[PDB]
Write a protein that binds this ligand. Sequence first.
Ligand SMILES: COCCCOc1cc(C(=O)N(C[C@@H]2CNC[C@H]2OC(=O)NCc2ccccc2)C(C)C)ccc1OC
Ligand SMILES: *[C@@H]1O[C@H](CO)[C@@H](O)[C@H](O)[C@H]1NC(C)=O
Length: 336
Amino acid sequence: TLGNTTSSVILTNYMDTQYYGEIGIGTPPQTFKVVFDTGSSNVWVPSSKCSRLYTACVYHKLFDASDSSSYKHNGTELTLRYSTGTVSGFLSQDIITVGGITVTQMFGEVTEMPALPFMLAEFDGVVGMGFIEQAIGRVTPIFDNIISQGVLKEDVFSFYYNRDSQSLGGQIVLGGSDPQHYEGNFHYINLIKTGVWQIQMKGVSVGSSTLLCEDGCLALVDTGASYISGSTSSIEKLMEALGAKKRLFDYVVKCNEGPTLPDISFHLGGKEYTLTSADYVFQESYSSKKLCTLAIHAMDIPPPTGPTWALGATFIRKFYTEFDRRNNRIGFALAR
Ligand SMILES: COCCCOc1cc(C(=O)N(C[C@@H]2CNC[C@H]2OC(=O)NCc2ccccc2)C(C)C)ccc1OC
Ligand SMILES: *[C@@H]1O[C@H](CO)[C@@H](O)[C@H](O)[C@H]1NC(C)=O
C-alpha cells in the first residue's frame, strides 16, 4: 500500500566516522541515539538490565521497560555479531517513534555490551535497515513494519551524509529522497539477490589502471560502516599502490604526501564512482612529521555475504544513496 507521506530524520555527524539520529521507545518516549544501518536488520538499544560492570552501559542511555506503559514482554535471547564486536540480550516489543512515524516494533534489549567498541560509540543503539532474511531470530525489520502501514509515498529510503562541521550532519528520508542534497540523476545498480544490500562491482582502479577487482567482485552498501573496506589482500595491494603503512587498526601515510595520492574509482553499474584523496584522507595536517589516517580499512567478511567490499560513510559522503525496496536496487547521485 502506498500513501502520500515522506518522513525525515536529521542526523548528527560525529568526526566523519559516526552518523546517528534519534528515536523514541515506549510511553512516555525514552530517546536513543541510533545508527540507521543497511548492513543489519535488527533494532537494538542498551537495556536497564545490562550489568553496570559493562562500562558501556554506564555511558549510554538504557531502556527501562518498567517505565513504559506500552511495553510488551517477549524475552527470547538474541546475539548479534559484527566485524567489530558482539552484543547480546533479549527481545521486547514497544512503540518506536522515527521522524513522526509511530510503529509497534520488536527490538533487542542489550544486556552484554563490550567496551570495545561501544565505549567509542556516540550512538546508543542500532536501527537495522536491511532485509528480514538477515534478521536474527527472523524479527520483522522496522522498514517492513513501516511499509505495512501503507503511509509512505514510495517503498524507498535515502541517505545523505554531510562532511563534518555547525549545521546538518546528515538526513534519512523514509518514503523518498531529498533533491536539495543531490544533483544530476540517480544511476541504479540492481541487487545480486534480495535479502542483502549488496551489488556487483566490475573493478576498482587506483589512478588510471584497473589494479583490483578485474574479474568482478561484490560491494555491500553499508550506512552503518565508517569506511570503505575490502579483503586483507585487496587492501594490501591498494595500500602498496598508495604508499601507505599498516598499523594496528588503520593505514596511514605521512600527512604531507596525502594531497598527492591518486583517485580511487569504483565501477558499479554503468558508471565509475571516483573519490579523490580529499574524499578518503583525514587531512589533519600537512606535516612530513605527522601521520594521517585513510578512510579505507581491511575487513575480511565471511561467507555467505563475503568475501566482499563494503561502501560505508566514506562513499556515501560523495554519493547520495537511495535504497529501493520495490525494485531491489540502489541508486547513487552526486551529493550536494
Ligand atoms: C557511519 O556511522 C555509523 C557508526 C560507525 O561507528 C561504529 C560502527 C560499529 C559497527 O561495526 N556496527 C555494525 C556494522 C555496520 N553494519 C554491519 C556491521 O559490521 C559488520 O559486521 N560488517 C560486515 C558484514 C556486514 C553485513 C553482513 C555480514 C558482515 C554498528 C553497531 C552499526 C561499531 C562501532 C562504531 O563506532 C565506535
Ligand atoms: C516472542 O515473539 C515471537 C515473534 O515471532 C513469538 O513467536 C514468540 O512466541 C514470542 N515469545 C513470547 C514468550 O512471547
